[PDB]
């Protein structure tokens, strides 16, 4: 689509739960609480992947909660940061399934986003060191609305729903209009229960080619 986030989120920006979330996060930053990612990065998934360009949606939960790590994309870390263990498991699955994929020397996934992979955490900020610390704000309400708008306004998006939380988040999606694939989370805590072998990266590309669209090149590139 020519559709943009601005076309469908302009009124959502004015909703009380959204305004209260931004105001709470801002007040915490002001009071000296370190919150990740930085304010300028919080909406980078939307900056890098416009609504009409979404081809694949991969949900996460929280941003990484250590210094310099999160930058507004699920799974990805800034250049120079050690590869997170869940992303390492994604790289292992990729190297086992995509012809010519080789282990990257970084974890920075902007180049996935620029190809139409929406790397959406369901909660968009976190206090330093403290997983789920911003879960009680309105981010899940916001990202529920984002998923509902992709479901409504697009056709044929691939959703890769990894783990229980992401699968529940995607329970609404129309499974005839879109292509929903489920597996365990790639975290070491669960990957051996079926993430390895899920073949989701190949399956997403097979769908895209059956739709007459270009596949994702899953090898990430440094800027």
């Amino acid at each position: 689509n020519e559709l943009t986030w601005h076309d469908v989120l302009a009124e959502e920006k004015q909703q009380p739960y959204f305004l209260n979330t931004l105001q709470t996060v801002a007040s915490e930053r002001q009071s000296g609480v370190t919150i990740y990612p930085p304010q300028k990065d919080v909406f980078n998934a939307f900056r890098f992947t416009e609504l009409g360009d979404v081809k694949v949606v991969i949900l996460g939960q929280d941003p990484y909660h250590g210094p310099g790590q999160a930058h507004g994309l699920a799974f990805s870390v800034r250049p120079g940061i050690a590869i997170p263990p869940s992303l390492l498991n994604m790289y292992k699955e990729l190297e086992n399934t995509i012809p010519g994929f080789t282990r990257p020397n970084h974890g920075y996934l902007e180049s996935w986003a620029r190809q139409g992979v929406l790397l959406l955490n369901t909660v968009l900020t976190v206090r330093a060191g403290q997983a789920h610390s911003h879960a009680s704000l309105g981010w899940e309400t916001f990202t529920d609305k984002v998923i509902s708008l992709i479901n409504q306004h697009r056709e044929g998006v691939v959703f890769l729903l990894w783990g229980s939380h992401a699968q529940k988040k995607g329970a609404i999606i129309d499974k005839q209009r879109h292509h929903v694939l489920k597996a365990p989370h790639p975290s070491p805590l669960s990957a051996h229960r079926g993430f390895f072998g899920c073949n989701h990266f190949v399956l997403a590309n097979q769908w895209l080619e059956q739709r007459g669209e270009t596949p994702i090149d899953w090898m990430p590139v440094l800027p």
Binding site: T4, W5, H6, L9, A10, K13, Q39, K40, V42, F43, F46, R47
Partner: peptide, 4 residues
């Protein structure tokens, strides 16, 4: 900082 909001792209919409």
């Amino acid at each position: 900082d909001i792209p919409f």
